[PDB]
Amino acid sequence: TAPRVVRDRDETNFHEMLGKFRFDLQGSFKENGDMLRDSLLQVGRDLFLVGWVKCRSRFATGHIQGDVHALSYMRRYLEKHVDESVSSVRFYEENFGMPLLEYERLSAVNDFRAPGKKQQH
Amino acid sequence: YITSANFSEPVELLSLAEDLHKAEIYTQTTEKLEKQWPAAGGVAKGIQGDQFFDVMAAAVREDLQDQSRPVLVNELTDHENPYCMKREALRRLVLHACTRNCLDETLTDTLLDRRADLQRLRSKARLPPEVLEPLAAFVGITRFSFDRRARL
Amino acid sequence: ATVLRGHCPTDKEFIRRALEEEQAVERIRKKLDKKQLQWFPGKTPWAP
Amino acid sequence: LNPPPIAFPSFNRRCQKDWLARRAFAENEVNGRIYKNVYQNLGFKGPIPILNKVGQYRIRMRCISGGYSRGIFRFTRMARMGMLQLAREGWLKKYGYRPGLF
Amino acid sequence: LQELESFVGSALRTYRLLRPHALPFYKEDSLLSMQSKLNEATLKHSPLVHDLVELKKRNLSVPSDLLPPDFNALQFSLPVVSARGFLLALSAAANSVAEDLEFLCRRLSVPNLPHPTHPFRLKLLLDALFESFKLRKDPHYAHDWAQRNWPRLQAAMPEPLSELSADSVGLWLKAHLERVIENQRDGRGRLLAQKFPLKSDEEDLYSLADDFIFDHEIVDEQFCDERLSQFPIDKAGELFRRVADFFGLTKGPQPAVNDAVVAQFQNLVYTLDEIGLSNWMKMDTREIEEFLPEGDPPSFAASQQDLDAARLLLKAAARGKANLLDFEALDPYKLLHGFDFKTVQEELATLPPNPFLTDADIDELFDITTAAVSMNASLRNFKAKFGRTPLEALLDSEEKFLTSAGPVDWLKDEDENGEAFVSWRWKRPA
Amino acid sequence: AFRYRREGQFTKFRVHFDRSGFRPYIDELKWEIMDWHYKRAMGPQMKK
Amino acid sequence: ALSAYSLRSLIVTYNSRNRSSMNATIENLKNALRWTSPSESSSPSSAPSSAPSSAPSSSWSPFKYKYALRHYVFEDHRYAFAFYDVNSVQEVVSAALG
Amino acid sequence: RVADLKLSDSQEQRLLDILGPERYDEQTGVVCLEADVFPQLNHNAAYLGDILQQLMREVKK
Amino acid sequence: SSDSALISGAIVRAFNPERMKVFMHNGCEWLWQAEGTGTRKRAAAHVIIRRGTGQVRVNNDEDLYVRWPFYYNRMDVLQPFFLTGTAGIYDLFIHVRGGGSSGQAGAVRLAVGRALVSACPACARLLEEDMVLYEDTRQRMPKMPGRMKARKMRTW
Amino acid sequence: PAERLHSLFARADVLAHLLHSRLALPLLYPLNSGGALTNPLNSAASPDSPAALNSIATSRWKREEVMSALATVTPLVLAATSVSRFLKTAHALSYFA
Amino acid sequence: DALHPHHPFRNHFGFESSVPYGVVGSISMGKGRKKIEKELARLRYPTLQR
Amino acid sequence: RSSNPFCLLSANKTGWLQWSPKQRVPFPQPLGKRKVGGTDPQPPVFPK
Amino acid sequence: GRQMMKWYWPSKYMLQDVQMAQYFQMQAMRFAPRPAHVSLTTLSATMEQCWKKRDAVRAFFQSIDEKVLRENPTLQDLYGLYRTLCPDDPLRTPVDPALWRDPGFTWQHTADQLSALAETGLGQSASEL
RNA sequence: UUUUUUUUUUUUUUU
């Protein structure tokens, strides 16, 4: 687990680093956010996403991790290239350069609560 | 890297002057030969006539192209089709050091298709043997050879 | 002349003559194939 | 721990015995028709004891990544666990396998 | 700040609809990087590249004269056509289309003052003013409208539909408008979904795109399926011939010979399909008119080198191949190596003839001498801006993303005479 | 009536394996899966 | 007579196991056209052949009374093309295979 | 096609009788002869050409 | 009579010459020929209307009561005619392929209903009382796997 | 107007509308994500020895590109407001009773 | 008829094809055609008269 | 040895093929946390 | 017999050994030439023999009518090759109907009859050490 | 169809 202090430069290692994404969406969505979740999953597979994501009617956040260069494209896609209406984009934290990764597969957390408890809640 | 035949620099030197540089020489030679050694008409019609001056001219072109086939160093398959030699030459160079991400590796196939240079040689290849051979047997003739070299 | 962009240059009459032949061979092949289709090939009634 | 290396099955005496009968039947396949032809021409029905040990029906389905002789199909040629491991390792995608449909 | 960013995001949506058969923005960008790196790798050890280096040490720039041809241009190790040459070819080709205004408007129905002859554009301004002669706000005022337009339309019309006076037309028009409004009170998918409210437009057009529908209580069911689901493009030629004959009966002011027009009109429809013509059928052409970058007219000197270079662009583009990169005699690989490089593109590549436009007479119909040098004011809507032009803001955001792609902030180092340099710098986290 | 959504139903439950256009896949995978291990074990060893 | 023969038609069919793979072939075939010597290139007709599918069945974990099942879908794709008056055999056969 | 092939009344009837109605279509009026008794393509192709000539020898009688 | 010149002069030639045969303004106002299509369950239909007071033939030159011997089935494939008053004016031709006994009857109601609207836009509002234009795209649910032999048939 | 309509109005308009080469390409063709990488050759771009072989001027020379893009966006609006609108008129009138 | 004394007949021999044969790479690279396979490679079609 | 002129192996005149020293897209991509069988030479160990 | 054999996995103790001795031999023999010329050798050193006996074969076709030319594989080829050495040779009034022999107008016979960029590259090639 | 027929309907297809 050698840090970037060993010899990363602009020759060949400039595109050999990992990190975490930074995004926090907020605003109303069509139906219950089904369109946004489906669109994000298809694009995420092409970029070989590892982290997870959360989608809902209003709340939309998550933690996405991957390559330093791969995540750069997603920043522009999820800021202007949005078919739905977006109010504003927030940020929580970011970090570039880290040995190995935490997650292994891309998945979206969905509300699988039973319908019986929905009325009580 | 004690020896001078295994460093990163020498590998690149032989990967351009022998892979891409040699491929272009064969490509131009094949096209140039066809201009100076034309045929009576269509390639398909020339086999059904069994006429002289067509079997002879075609045979000469086959030997000239074979003698003018450079031997690739990095590639050991030794392909005979000029279209395939150029298509595969770029794949080896692109996979050496061209890409910068996982996605770029998967998009290598699309890069070759977008290039207009490779699209010109797609419609120029050898006729498969199983084109006229079945038809010849139908009429029941035992005096025709599909191969041009053997026919002469 | 009167040639469109994405269209076949061949005459329409030639296609109609050739198209009918293809439909005839397909019908004959299906009829003959169904006749020679039975379990245990080579078995015939009261043959032994 | 470490899932099995699916390319090389473990040792199994019963599994090897099934393949032994296949070779014997192939060489004796010609003799099987001769025995039926002579009886048919003469018009007499009789047994053929020699076909018991070299018969085609002696061989049955078996699992290649296994050694059990049950639960094997002609399409996959694998047991319940053989298909699960092969499909989950990422090997059937090239062969048109979409698990999305039920 | 918030309004400026919103316009940039909305503008990108219009450009996406113009590229139906193309990869997304995140796919084409990656491909360009591979092409740029491939050119450098292939041209690293070229004989020409090494020859120039040795000449500098020996203090001998040019021994006799220029070796290379005066038609090539390489930027960032990528092939690019002349920027100035494209404008001349595009303007000259599009200028001949507007020539029909003389025999359609300047001789039949003068639209007041159409423009000066050719100020800058002469392409879209003509249509904007000519189409502004038909206005309608209140149905009660429709009677007076027929008294100011009937006389002008009494020439280019069928004989049976020309004997009536202005008052006769008004009687039917007055009753027709009332029926449409009453019926407008599966019809909601083409009334509020397509119309774009502005709050500033006091009146709206009639009988243009979607105003002539809903005449009766009930409309056709299958009609809607051919506008939203998919527009039938195969019948483009059939409809055009069935409408053109109404104006031209072969015995009126129009010529008596018209047969080859239908065959050629079909090609224009197929060519526009790639641009995204099918998308405009479903969505009303309102977003493109409003949400679109704009700027000042071009201004440059037409040099002799650029004037002759534009001729080749109009030659190969007449057959359908409007791209110079796909043709030979442009690849730098064969130029720096001494391969079989020639200028036979006009005979070898241009083998397929075009027996519909012309055989060997392109400059005759398309006058290249026009515009060019003679080309050397703000619009009504373009003037109202916060200094920065709409196009300047759009490119500013795009440049900040492509240039800043990664653990990066590639900086400003020289801003003079257009030339500039870039480098690398570390980026700290927040 | 959904026509495209029900495509391939006829050749899923009312067709024989030997009387259909579907080709086997086990034959190709037999020689493909085995070769993968050969290149992995002998790959680094040959270079060393 | 052999010299009196002529290729009346050439029905070209494809069989792809993936959606993306089939789409790549269509684009590649189109690019090979619009480059022949004659003014109009050979433009074959399209004829889809549906999409056959297969999915066997198996009992589902062992030591169970058949309470659940797991299916394995194996879709397929097909495509057919038609040709008429193939004057140039080299410019058609090579393009289809390439 | 039988219609294109010019033959006498007696000869025309025998052509369809030997092959039977299975290899004859009453709609268009064409006869298809299929031969596949060999695994190889070349071997099978030559076989068809031999039987075809023999059929015409007996038809004209 | 200037109003009729603009209306009658535009229907002829020009955009769509098909709409040229009418039976006065009041009482029929129906087109000479019309077409309609209807889908219900695993079946299809194609009904065409033509002028004539003849009988009703479905296919293979047969009568109507043969396909639908039941009384309720025959009434469903003729309900729109009674409401519109075309009881004995226009002919009826029903062509179907597949389905069942009562499955094909429903497709005819949707097919014939879509034909009358095309022939007369005005004669479409009165047909909403009986819900003729309404269809049923939903189909039978699949048999779930497991122990249940049927969709929800339990066992001991 | 017989010799200026047969092959002038239905043919020449196609040439002006054939802008797919400049429209299909990306907005930033000469600049990509890897534009500041080692793509330029160090032996032919660093010392500035050559003059025509290479030219690193695509970072601030947007004036030429801005003018080129401006001329390609005006004709697009005309096609949608003249061609698409004209077709809709025939389609709508094809079902008028 | 004199082409083969062991098979006195008019037409027995055909022509050889130019179809590639053999394995691209395996333990049987140097196999080509079998002893019995070469006979049918130079004949129009196999028979059962021998 | 097929007669396809566009094939990549039909024109192979030798029994040796190049091996990629580095790969960024592993062919045997798992669908989860499961590893590839036969990729653990060293035996495991338990805390005991 | 052949259907049941297709089962189980193949043998594993018959794979090619990775021997370094055989690796060097393959590389050394990879750059071998191809001096086959099986077809060219047959045609070569044959035209001279026909030229020596040109007068002897000149009368062969005079006594043979066109209708007698039934064996084209031996006669048609001979006639075509003969005309290559002697383009002009009128034997008699009757001639081929452009079917069995197409002499054409622009044929090939035994008797025989770079740019600024490329030229500039050669001048500077052998000018640096 | 006033020298016309002489009749029940299925689970892929007229691309």
Numbering used by the authors:
A (entry chain HS): 78 to 198
B (entry chain HF): 1 to 152
C (entry chain HC): 191 to 238
D (entry chain HD): 1 to 102
E (entry chain HJ): 149 to 333, 338 to 528, 536 to 589
F (entry chain HI): 1 to 48
G (entry chain HC): 1 to 60, 82 to 119
H (entry chain HP): 186 to 246
Quoted from the paper:
Our study reveals how Toxoplasma gondii assembles over 40 mt-rRNA fragments using exclusively nuclear-encoded mitoribosomal proteins and three lineage-specific families of RNA-binding proteins. Cryo-EM analysis of the mitoribosome structure demonstrates how these AP2 proteins function as RNA binders to maintain mitoribosome integrity. The mitoribosome is also decorated with members of lineage-specific RNA-binding proteins belonging to RAP (RNA-binding domain abundant in Apicomplexa) proteins and HPR (heptatricopeptide repeat) families, highlighting the unique adaptations of these parasites. Our results reveal the structure and composition of the most fragmented rRNA mitoribosome to date.
The LSU was resolved to 2.89 Å, and the entire mitoribosome was locally refined to three bodies, the SSU head, the SSU body and the LSU, at resolutions of 3.6 Å, 3.29 Å and 3.11 Å, respectively. The first striking feature is the relative size of the SSU compared to the LSU, as the former appears substantially larger with an elongated oval-shaped head. The SSU harbors two particularly protein-rich regions, on the top of the head and the bottom (foot) of the body. On the top of the head, a cluster of mainly three large proteins (mS29, mS139 and mS141) form a tight domain around two short unassigned leftover rRNA fragments (ulr22 and ulr23). Interestingly, the universally conserved uS3m at the entrance of the mRNA binding channel is absent in the T. gondii mitoribosome and is instead replaced by the C-terminal and N-terminal tails of mS151 and mS148. Finally, one must highlight the absence of the conserved uS7m at the exit of the mRNA channel in T. gondii, a position that seems to partially overlap with mtAP2-1. Also, uS5m is substantially enlarged in this mitoribosome, as it has acquired a large SSU-head domain and N-terminal and C-terminal extensions on the SSU body. As anticipated, mtAP2-1 on the SSU is located at the head-to-body junction near the platform. Specifically, mtAP2-1 interacts mainly with fragments SSUB and SSUD with its first AP2 domain binding directly to the 3’ end of SSUD and interacting minorly with SSUB, mostly via arginine residues with the RNA backbone.
